[PDB]
Amino acid sequence: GCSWIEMDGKVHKFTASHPESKEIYEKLSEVTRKLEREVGYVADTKFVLHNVDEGEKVQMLHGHSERIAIAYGLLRTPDRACLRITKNLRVCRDCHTFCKLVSKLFRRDIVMRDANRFHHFESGLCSCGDSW
Amino acid sequence: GCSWIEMDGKVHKFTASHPESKEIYEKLSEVTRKLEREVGYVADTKFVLHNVDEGEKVQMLHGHSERIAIAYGLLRTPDRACLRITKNLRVCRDCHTFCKLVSKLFRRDIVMRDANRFHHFESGLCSCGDSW
Ligand SMILES: [Zn+2]
Ligand SMILES: [Zn+2]
Ligand SMILES: [Zn+2]
Ligand SMILES: [Zn+2]
């Protein structure tokens, strides 16, 4: 599970969590805090335990790699700039809503190509009509 | 959270899980499998996560230390022998039922003194009347 952002032929990859910088995750924390304060949106925490009993580690079901890529793009690309995100998996439903809200809240188009579909987000809505 | 078993002035302590022997936990596995097959009893798995997100470890809410002590006593003490268990905590409800079923299924008295009460198990019932 990984995600790339394309900025005029510049590609950066994001997975998982070894931070490229700490200012990305603080940008991401302020963006997510914006979503809950502005529109009252909270994502759902999903995880697995391969065995519940006695000291197993928590494994998250969705890496949310594109969220980090979006935060990166809001830092390095100028305003109104289209964020171009690529994913090798199917975008999860919470991240799809995340992209919609960001595209409207921050007034930026987002062209996401996931494992099977091009998602063009603009002004809060997507080209796929929320069917993918 | 620990538990002691007293065998004629011989005291063994059990916590957590570094096994004294592997034959104790295989005795315990066969005893618990007896409880589900004979009387259809399954315990409830309770645990905590201090933070759900991203790789935290699972911490169990009840160590069930006396269960290991009981299995130990069924190995080293002869039949009909009273198992004397001490706990520094309050015996949990599932372990209290565990002690009741064992005292009837294996025909042994169990004198458990927990953090505040003497529990005398015999023939499936306890001296506390399931109020502790
Ligand atoms: Zn996601
Ligand atoms: Zn879409
Ligand atoms: Zn217990
Ligand atoms: Zn009792």
Residue numbers in the entry:
A (entry chain A), B (entry chain A): 826 to 841, 845 to 960
The authors write:
Nuclear-encoded pentatricopeptide repeat (PPR) proteins with a C-terminal DYW domain have been characterized as site-specific factors for C-to-U RNA editing in plant mitochondria and plastids. Here we report crystal structures of the DYW domain of an Arabidopsis thaliana (A. thaliana) plastid RNA editing factor, OTP86, as the outcome of a solubility and crystallization screening of over 100 different DYW domain constructs from 30 PPR proteins. OTP86 was characterized as a site-specific factor for an editing site in rps14 transcripts. Herein we describe structures of a DYW domain and find that, apart from a cytidine deaminase fold, DYW domains contain a characteristic DYW motif, stabilized by a zinc atom, as well as a gating domain that controls zinc-mediated catalysis sterically and catalytically.
